[PDB]
């Protein structure tokens, strides 16, 4: 897949992703906060279509992500991110995708997610998160 | 004066300021680095004219500020920043303005300046710096 | 169980733990680096016996943990940490305890683990990690 790296910002305002209930996560995009103003991250897109879009609009800055969880597993011979769930201090967004394979979970006791990086081919291959106080 | 707060970025690419050899620092503007690309900060302008402009273009990222020094003193009954000097690992820029009043010095042994805030009326009233690893 | 919190240090020098394949992790003790000197953390030990002891000695400062993974599961009616694996830039230490139950994984791309907190009763109930640059 094509690697991407948004870098680090001041916070998160919105997550726009797409998924398929039979395969995995497709497109991934973030509207970050940058010093009190929205910063529209690049939309990282799948090389195929047929996904369902979701908009996760956070009530920034009072609402912020406290846990990111999901599943990784094989789709057409590739290990990809099959499902994602975002839990904030206000509500839970998801699961989106297919809850099958190996689970993962990143709860945060102290700190914030301030950026994303990863890779997307037909599906979201992998991702990492920038954390800051 | 009018308060300003640029917030935090990834580094510094350029500083554009103005000064008057009989008064103090006027204008202050910064081109930051944001995740590998320039981010042009808001131009914080003096309410008065007649200043001399200066461009401090840095060889980002290998060149970075290691010390900010200057002078504070009274101009028309206002305590303002009268002079500034920026020392990097490669060159010294300044002094710009009037080297009179009370000196101040911020040497950095580990870490980077990643942002500026302060206030400008007829002159640069005060300023602070965001530091990060 | 009895909660514990070692707090935050400069790095990690040694991890002592114990496990039983039929149950879970039964001891957890860390020798941290504190500004160049080893700092022996408190020994967080099980209320019971019959565990296999493990000493992970790291080649600090060149060698450091790049991933902590493991499994959680129900043991005698309690959700506990059944298994742990520590991957460094040199080698993989573990798994210590059976690779069964719900997996968790914390890979680190940038930064370091600098402290542990958690709870221990008959076994390691839960744990969290302090991260820093």
């Amino acid at each position: 897949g094509k690697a991407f790296d948004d870098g680090v910002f001041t916070g998160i305002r919105e997550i726009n992703l797409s998924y398929n209930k039979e395969t995995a996560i497709g497109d991934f995009q973030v509207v970050y906060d940058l010093n009190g103003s929205p910063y529209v991250g690049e939309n990282h897109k799948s090389f195929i279509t047929g996904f369902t879009p979701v908009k996760i609009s956070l009530d920034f800055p009072s609402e912020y992500i406290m846990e990111v969880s999901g599943y990784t597993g094989k789709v057409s011979g590739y290990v990809v991110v099959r499902s994602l769930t975002f839990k904030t201090n206000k509500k839970t967004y998801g699961p989106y995708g297919v809850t099958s394979g190996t689970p993962f979970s990143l709860p945060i006791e102290n700190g914030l997610i301030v950026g994303f990086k990863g890779s997307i081919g037909y599906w979201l291959d992998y991702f990492s998160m920038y954390l800051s106080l | 004066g009018k308060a300003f707060d640029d917030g935090v970025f990834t580094g510094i690419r350029e500083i554009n300021l103005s000064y008057n050899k009989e008064t103090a620092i006027g204008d202050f503007q910064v081109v930051y680095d944001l995740n590998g690309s320039p981010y042009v900060g808001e131009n914080h302008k003096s309410f008065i004219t007649g200043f001399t402009p200066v461009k401090i273009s840095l060889d980002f990222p290998s060149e970075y500020i290691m010390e900010v020094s200057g002078y504070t003193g009274k101009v028309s009954g206002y305590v303002v920043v009268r002079s500034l000097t920026f020392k990097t690992n490669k060159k010294t820029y300044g002094p710009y303005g009037v080297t009179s009043g009370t000196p101040f010095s911020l040497p950095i042994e580990n870490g980077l300046i990643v942002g500026f805030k302060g206030s400008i009326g007829y002159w640069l009233d005060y300023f602070s710096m965001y530091l990060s690893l | 169980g009895k909660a514990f919190d070692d707090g935050v240090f400069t790095g990690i020098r040694e991890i002592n733990l114990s496990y039983n394949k039929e149950t879970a992790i039964g001891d957890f003790q860390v020798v941290y680096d504190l500004n160049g000197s080893p700092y022996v953390g408190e020994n967080h030990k099980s209320f019971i016996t019959g565990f296999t002891p493990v000493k992970i000695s790291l080649d600090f400062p060149s060698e450091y943990i790049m991933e902590v993974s493991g499994y959680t599961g129900k043991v005698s009616g309690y959700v506990v940490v059944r298994s742990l694996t520590f991957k460094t830039n040199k080698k993989t230490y573990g798994p210590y305890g059976v690779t069964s139950g719900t997996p968790f994984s914390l890979p680190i791309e940038n930064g370091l683990i600098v402290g542990f907190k958690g709870s221990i009763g008959y076994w390691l109930d839960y744990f969290s990690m302090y991260l820093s640059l």
Partner: peptide
């Protein structure tokens, strides 16, 4: 040391 600010990064989850 260089002029680029650093941040903690956790991951990757998925392939590799």
């Amino acid at each position: 040391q260089s002029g680029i600010s650093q941040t903690v990064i956790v991951g990757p989850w998925g392939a590799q």
